[PDB]
């Protein structure tokens, strides 16, 4: 009443990462960028990454959310010109 | 003549004039779940759509 060996055979299961909302769309106080949950969002867009430059999301409200390192936590604000006096 | 899983009618169930129906959250709790707290703040009420048709119906009439 056990299990065997020499049959590696070991399928893998599912995930579901994304950039949801990609860069520069109607910004809604909701899941910003994703690739590491428990995540700790940030302020506006993010531009820090194992790449160099940065990314703007011409979309501004409360905040977004990170992914733990990847992408690059937000902080470089960027409400967007669409955040002035009505 | 007709009745209804009177059951489910008992447990989880009961509609609003809206023509809609709901039953208490229903995460985990009330079995195994030393788990956490804030998770607790995880039992109010959950309204599933579509299917809530078998339901409602099958109940139909009194509820």
């Amino acid at each position: 009443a056990h299990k065997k060996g020499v049959g590696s055979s070991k399928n893998g299961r599912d995930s579901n990462p994304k950039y949801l909302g990609v860069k520069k769309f109607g910004g809604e106080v909701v899941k910003a960028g994703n690739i590491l949950v428990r995540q700790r969002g940030t302020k506006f867009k993010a531009g820090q990454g194992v790449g160099m430059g940065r990314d703007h999301t011409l979309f501004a409200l409360s905040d977004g959310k990170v992914v733990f390192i990847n992408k690059g936590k937000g902080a470089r604000f960027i409400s967007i010109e669409a955040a002035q006096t009505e | 003549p007709k009745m209804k899983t009177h059951k489910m009618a008992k447990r989880r169930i009961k509609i609003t004039g809206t023509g809609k129906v709901m039953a208490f959250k229903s995460g985990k709790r009330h079995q195994n779940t030393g788990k956490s707290g804030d998770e607790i703040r995880g039992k109010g009420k959950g309204f599933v759509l579509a299917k809530a048709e078998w339901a409602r119906m099958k109940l139909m009439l009194p509820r």
């Binding site: - | 195994n32 779940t33 030393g34 788990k35 956490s36 707290g37 607790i40």
Partner: protein, 53 residues
């Protein structure tokens, strides 16, 4: 939970009476009859809190 007399043992802790308790998982592993910390029972707020049960 999965009651496993394996250094894995579930317990709580009163509120000096603040009245009832609050959730917690544990491990004899170390400090046996050891278990104290404060909270706030329906009883006002705070209150010392032994855990033993």
């Amino acid at each position: 939970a999965k009651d496993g007399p394996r250094i894995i043992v579930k317990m709580e802790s009163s509120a000096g009476t603040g009245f009832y308790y609050t959730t917690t998982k544990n491990r004899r592993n170390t400090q046996a009859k050891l278990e104290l910390k404060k909270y706030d029972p329906v009883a006002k707020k705070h209150v010392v809190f032994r855990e033993k049960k």
